[PDB]
Amino acid sequence: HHWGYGKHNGPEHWHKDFPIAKGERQSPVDIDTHTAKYDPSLKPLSVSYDQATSLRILNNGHAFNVEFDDSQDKAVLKGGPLDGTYRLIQFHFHWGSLDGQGSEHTVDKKKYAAELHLVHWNTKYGDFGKAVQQPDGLAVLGIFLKVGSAKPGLQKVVDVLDSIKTKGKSADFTNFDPRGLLPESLDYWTYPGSLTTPPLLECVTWIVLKEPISVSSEQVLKFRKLNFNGEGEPEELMVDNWRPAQPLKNQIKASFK
Ligand SMILES: NS(=O)(=O)c1ccc2c(c1)[C@H]1CCC[C@H]1[C@@H](c1ccccc1Cl)N2
Numbered sequence: 001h002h003w004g005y006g007k008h009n010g011p012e013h014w015h016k017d018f019p020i021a022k023g024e025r026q027s028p029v030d031i032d033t034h035t036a037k038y039d040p041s042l043k044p045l046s047v048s049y050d051q052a053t054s055l056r057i058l059n060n061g062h063a064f065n066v067e068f069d070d071s072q073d074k075a076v077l078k079g080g081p082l083d084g085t086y087r088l089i090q091f092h093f094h095w096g097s098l099d100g101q102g103s104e105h106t107v108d109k110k111k112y113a114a115e116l117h118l119v120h121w122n123t124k125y126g127d128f129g130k131a132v133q134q135p136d137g138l139a140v141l142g143i144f145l146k147v148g149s150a151k152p153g154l155q156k157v158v159d160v161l162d163s164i165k166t167k168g169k170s171a172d173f174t175n176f177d178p179r180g181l182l183p184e185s186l187d188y189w190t191y192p193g194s195l196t197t198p199p200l201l202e203c204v205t206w207i208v209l210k211e212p213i214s215v216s217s218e219q220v221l222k223f224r225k226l227n228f229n230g231e232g233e234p235e236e237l238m239v240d241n242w243r244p245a246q247p248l249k250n251q252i253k254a255s256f257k
């Protein structure tokens with residue numbers, strides 16, 4: 001009876017195995033745009049993905065992860081609110097059963113159709129497993145998806161999903177360029193938070209871009225054909241794999257006016 005997104009094992013249950021679910025810096029949150037304060041001392045984000053090395057795509061039973069070689073500084077995030085160098089390890093998405101829901105963060109209570117998370121770890125901690133034990137261990141770049149025009153740089157991901165339909169399936173996924181998933185503007189909000197799934201560790205500097213990317217209805221429909229279940233188990237569509245907004249408790253900063 002492990003955690004998931006169902007009635008009996010979803011977000012309102014997670015605190016029984018993971019008491020930090022009720023902690024002081026949980027994610028996601030609602031971004032109240034009028035309450036966020038412009039921080040003129042915040043630096044532009046530096047997103048250096050030209051040497052990114054994608055390896056594989058995995059259905060882990062909760063989402064699909066596109067994994068990268070993080071054994072050298074090859075795709076890194078720096079600047080913004082960050083001190084030092086954060087290495088890209090993987091990206092994944094959260095999405096809805098309907099276009100009106102799916103994002104984890106919300107903007108003035110607005111839900112987007114989906115949310116992309118580019119996960120990076122602070123190289124001063126040596127490995128990802130050490131970094132998640134630290135309050136400044138991770139930097140997650142969050143990008144909203146709205147339904148409209150197709151995102152051409154997403155299509156190579158959409159077209160491989162048939163090969164990883166079920167939990168535990170993986171496929172080779174080399175030479176994927178994550179620059180094709182980035183909006184024009186790097187204007188962002190930032191706050192200290194957590195992983196949005198168990199183990200819900202409070203190790204994340206969240207950086208959430210203001211400008212969404214557009215994807216087509218056909219692209220997100222293909223996300224919704226994935227399965228939470230393993231092969232030869234009853235089919236349960238992988239939809240609504242998002243945690244709702246958590247209390248802000250004790251400030252969201254904006255990079256822009
Ligand atoms: N929705 S998200 O971007 O906040 C998110 C949620 C859960 C997980 C991740 C990212 C990645 C990033 C940090 C930990 C790692 C993962 C995990 C896997 C292997 C080993 C340890 C851990 Cl903690 N769990």
Ligand SMILES: [Zn+2]
Pocket residue numbers: 092093094117196
């Ligand atoms: Zn995520």
